[model samples]
Target: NLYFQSNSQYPDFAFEINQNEFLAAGVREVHAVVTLTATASENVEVIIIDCSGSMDYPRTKMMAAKEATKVAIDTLTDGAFFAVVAGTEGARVVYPTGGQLLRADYQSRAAAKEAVGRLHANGGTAMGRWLAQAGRIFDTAPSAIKHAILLTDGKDESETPADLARAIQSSIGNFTADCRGIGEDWEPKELRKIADALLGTVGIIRDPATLAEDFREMTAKSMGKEVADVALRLWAPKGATIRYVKQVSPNLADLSGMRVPGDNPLTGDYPTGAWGAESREYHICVEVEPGNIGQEKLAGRVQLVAKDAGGATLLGEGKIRAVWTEDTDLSTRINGRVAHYTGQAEMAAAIQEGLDAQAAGDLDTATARLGRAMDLAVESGHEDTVKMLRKVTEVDPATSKVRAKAKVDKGDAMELDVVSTKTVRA
Candidate 1:
């Protein structure tokens, strides 16, 4: 199966820079050579794998996940810090050192892979424990843009769901992590929670046989993040409340909870660590009561925050406006790119709800919703989602009807399971 691949031409979605003002914002009008205060750096990344009892059942999935992890290790660039986390009933450091995360380089990658080969599956899942461990490891390299690849197969066992969520919440400022739930047994909402806490995407690895391949692609993207921790800081007036902040493409993550104290006037930071060749777009909404018409009020503001390769930060900010314009186009139809992915997020939500209905014996509701989800998927040119949808129901999405006697096999079931939790494109 063809996975969602990041294109080389893709430049990470960035804050719109007003060239002249940006250059002049904090000008150092010195002598001949003016030293700019800004600098750039790369982020520290960690790979976390869930090796639990269930993994042994699907031998191929575990094998593929391991191989993919190795590939990720091999691709790590020098100067980047990384580690392999084997998560089961509890979390343990399987590579580098027991409590130490290894710095990325040819030598470290080889050693990490060699150590990974010795990983074995067992125990229950203590996802919270794993995340807590990742947080501690990240603390070791506070200056680096911290990220993790959390590969799992199910929900929490080591801790309660509430505990898991708290773990994610408490560790918000620690780092960002991209989560991958392997196979059908995993929970989408569970993985999404972690993804939201950290600033990362949630995805599914439907086939253990392809785990390695998926990890390889994910690792490559991680390695390519050239900038460290660039945050999107939003500054709203006293009366304004954040409705939501979404990273529209590649995946949708609600970053509304990441608000922190700001400097100068004040602002929030949206982490954009280590930019790849690709661009990620964010759709921010602030719900404020009706203000005076033509009042020219700034609804809210956005800032891009990233640490340099040396761990210093570069701050970039943008604004959102509320104009009582006569033109309906601006209000009804958003940026085509933004609107397209908003539907994508909606489709994902609908699909999950529909699936939940099906599992709960509400076939009628499930069919109706899944049918609409199919319609949206087709209309949006989300071929990957359309293909995945096809696996579960033999629907002629155009008509929203089953083509023939479609059987929801394990593979089909898993695809739907994973896609619901991990599907997003930017």
Candidate 2:
């Protein structure tokens, strides 16, 4: 028997399966969209800025970073605990004077700004050490929601990739971090890895002038969060294999790779980090052994799980069922949400590949790939992506044909690449 209990402290979860029936003869994939919504809470915020020597090359870059950090400090809500870390080959706490986070108020904000003003470019880039320090800082506030902003203008050259990976593994459950890379000197994939590991967003800052505004917005959002460490818990039946778990709306995040140990070996829990008064959709795919025709079995159990004063609670839940059928129409009908998101994932991949080909000077491949992406974007009503995609390609919508633009602005290209993962709700 399946029953769902509602909890006020947790987000409501509702799921929709793409197909009502399953094929009886072979292994079939079951897709579902789990929608969640939760209330906001108190949280801690950390701002990490790169003080590497390269930031001073443009001169204005380091200055802009300092100004932006001050804006972020000012944006924190009163009573919010926050700290700033200047990152280079080493990391140092630049605010609160002491090593711990200080409550935000007029006095602390001013002092934090003063500390940020003293930040200077000198050492090489070592993000792993910075993250490790942030992790330790977060350990002090176990109950409060923890979030961080990581801003870098150059690649992480001082530490080996293994060091960075180890640092990320250690920081997984301690806090979430949003990563922003200003200019083209940093690798998007590197930042993307960090963000994904922390269950946060990653993007390009585009220009130094926009840093202050972005930082302010990020800080405000952090202050708005009310829930912490929410998990999407999935329980699949015996003889079933989970093919993949991904967040489809807002952005495409592969959760299959980040599954934490659940109640048992048959279960997996994926972290969703802090939440505000918001809604998100996740796509879960499962494969199970085919059963006899006309037989029905529970395919998977998805729960919006959380903990509170009363202990662990099930906020909401939905069930996935497999009803083996021979009826063609019953098994053939496609769910609109599933179809839309599948195309969205394809569009994102196409844009990434198209850009890679273009960067490698393979014009023919780039044009064809981008043309397909444009068509998918148009078909999916992704006007934002379409507009950005237009900056790099001249498109003939009628024929679904495109030509790589002879000249494209660097900022525009980076923006397209960074925002390609964004998706509209279905």
Candidate 3:
């Protein structure tokens, strides 16, 4: 029994705007926090397993992968249409074997696990091929909530970087894939690219033994999808230039370059995959012509549109307004949500730069950047980042001086890099 009736139960798409409407005369920049709350389908869930040679080295990596695959297979809601795919030098469907997805019934679920058991780590890694194959499986679902979980323990060594790029470009709307790289041998950068491009969440699975539980969680999360193919459409006035559009809360993901031209040049559409019952906050900045005192204008308008065979529906919307004012106090006021996320984004940048500087033997620069990161993290109550910061640098408790550690853990450095974009809510 569905907790709520499926697709028809719109998850109350609500939008809120947080910004200082008053602006100093000749002010051109307008920054706002656009928040959408409540959320999401024919849904297709594809489980991708990595059978690359690297996974077999530690032994448990491949063993854990098989266990996770079966866990995910058992987690699907009802007898839904789903498939299991194996990725290596080439990608191939491992279940329901004839290039088609099978309904998740007891017989098929058991058979799927059997197929996963037969999978072995024998080929080189090429993540793009696996993704492209998942896209084909999602294609069969055609419409509704389409999603996947892709797990890998090696780099995409079997193909060119551009080949992966090409594959990501082709699969934009086909489905959203939550990507994970198990253990240190894999590259987080590669998974980040695929996850961001396909509008999915990217993460690390440092311990393979815990993978089956993670898979169960990821699968249960996907099963909550209530909507599909949602786009954040921004309509700006004449002469207004968009500085950038980014998902700031939950995670920091820049989506400025992913705009699909809307009806006119004034509007740009950014596709933001599927949704469940949750909230996401985005930071949208626009530069408009300087405004004269006492003047007012609509800086930008946002619309959350969901696409369907019947066309599109406006799920929710909000407005960004700009007003010229003479009072300094009114013009100088900042939106807390906007300021918190702004620092959050900047802190992430500092962490990355600090790590890179340390890598290049620039101890002075690394200390400065990481210290700045620590300060911001402390200010924002970002304890996770603070914990990671402690591993790389020492913050003087009394003097407040910062110094890079003589040595750093490779895994800690990579963990910071991978999760730096995540943010705590204001």
Better of 1 and 3 by TM-score: 3
Candidate 1 C-alpha lDDT tens digits along 1-426:
212322212233445421111111122111010011222244577788888888777787677777888888776677778888888878888777856665777778888888788888788998888988888888888656577899888778678888888788877877878888877777777887887777777777666667677777777777765554555667777766666666655565556666665663445655544565665666665655454434445667665544433333334446665544334443344345545656777887878877677666676677777777778888977777777777666656697665322345655655675565344443
* Backbone clash pairs in model 1 (N, Cα, C under 3 Å; residues 3+ apart or in different chains), count: 40
Best by TM-score: 3
Better of 2 and 3 by lDDT: 3
Q: What's each prediction's clash count?
A: 40, 3, 3
Model 1 regions lying over 4 Å from their true place: 1-43, 104-107, 261-267, 272-274, 289-295, 307-315, 325-341, 394-407, 421-426
Of 2 and 3, which scores higher on TM-score?
3
* lDDT tens per residue, model 3, 185-234: 77777988998888877788888889999999999988888877789999
Local error of candidate 2 at residue 209 (angstroms): 2.3
Q: Whole-model Cα lDDT per candidate?
A: 0.65, 0.83, 0.87
lDDT of 2 by residue, 249-282 (tens): 8898889998887768888998888777677888
Residue 12, candidate 1: alpha-carbon lDDT: 38
